[model samples]
Target: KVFGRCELAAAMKRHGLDNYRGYSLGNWVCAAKFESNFNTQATNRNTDGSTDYGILQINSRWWCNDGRTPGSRNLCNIPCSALLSSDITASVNCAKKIVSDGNGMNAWVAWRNRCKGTDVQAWIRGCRL
Candidate 1:
């Protein structure tokens, strides 16, 4: 599913992403916007042979098991394919697990370069969270 900006914001909030691990909903929203453009089915294969999947772009190298990524840790204990579902529940859950693992939101390079330290509140400004 390709969500509208505010629509994605609301969905993230409903999934308990608001202020999660000291990161605000806007941070997640902004990260998703840049990482996957609000598309649930987004996927990217990295040069290191790991693949990133879904809205939050969880990686196969350390997060989920894709069966193809060499030496995958599968820390989230989820199949990488699960992250591509339009439901996004698995993706959101894995995202929380990523942060809880001490990686912080910086786990995503896109978020680190784009969303972090920025005024992201505008990303969810008009959304009724």
Candidate 2:
């Protein structure tokens, strides 16, 4: 989900976020920037040109097959309860799996150390473009 600018800055620091060594933190930010602007609770519907919903803008129709009432099976479609949980780790873990699929969280791993001693502008360059 999207954190406020101030909060995200601090979080970036706390999480050792930086951009360098060909690592762009943009992937993580993309969903926040384009989808819900950091609101995990954000959702959209018809006339919005978006069947996509939520922080990652996951399609509601696909997720509709999900059993919201816990203990239910995933026979509907893709299981969605994991992404709907209050635990960000659970939701994000699923997101990561969907993004990288067992490869590893290289973006996070890189940002934590690459620009530790470099200029922010340079890191930003590494993050964008």
Candidate 3:
């Protein structure tokens, strides 16, 4: 369920997610599929494909690696560009600032809508809203 590069597994391992029923990456991916169809490398172009970028079905130009500040990236040991380059949680969060007004509400919606209640996968597949 929590499919991706090792970073996800490492993040999960560190969080003890397997036993943490309320938060697991498996449920997170299901929610993303609903939001962006699970397109990690997804990009929106300006008719000419010139403004390529990522989003949680949102936009990037503002909150992504392109405009990311320094020091913050290193604190996480992953640069904004590196975070932007992938379709992971870090990537989604990076792109989410736009919709969340930099508050992360979109991601939280996914959590509440998909991963919060029981049967994490069930709620995302039209079972709940």
- By lDDT: ranked, best first: 1, 3, 2
RMSD of 3: 8.4
After superposition, the stretches of candidate 1 with alpha carbons farther than 4 Å from their true spots are: none
lDDT of each: 0.91, 0.41, 0.41
lDDT of 2 by residue, 1-129 (tens): 556634433344344332322324544454334555666665555352324334454543433334333333332244444444333443343444333534333323332344323343432243222
Candidate 1 residue pairs that clash: none
The best candidate in terms of lDDT: 1
- C-alpha RMSD (angstroms) for model 1: 0.9
List the candidate 2 regions with Cα displacement exceeding 4 Å: 6-23, 45-53, 60-65, 68-87, 101-129
TM-score of each: 0.96, 0.43, 0.37
Q: Worst ten-residue run, lDDT, model 1?
A: 99-108
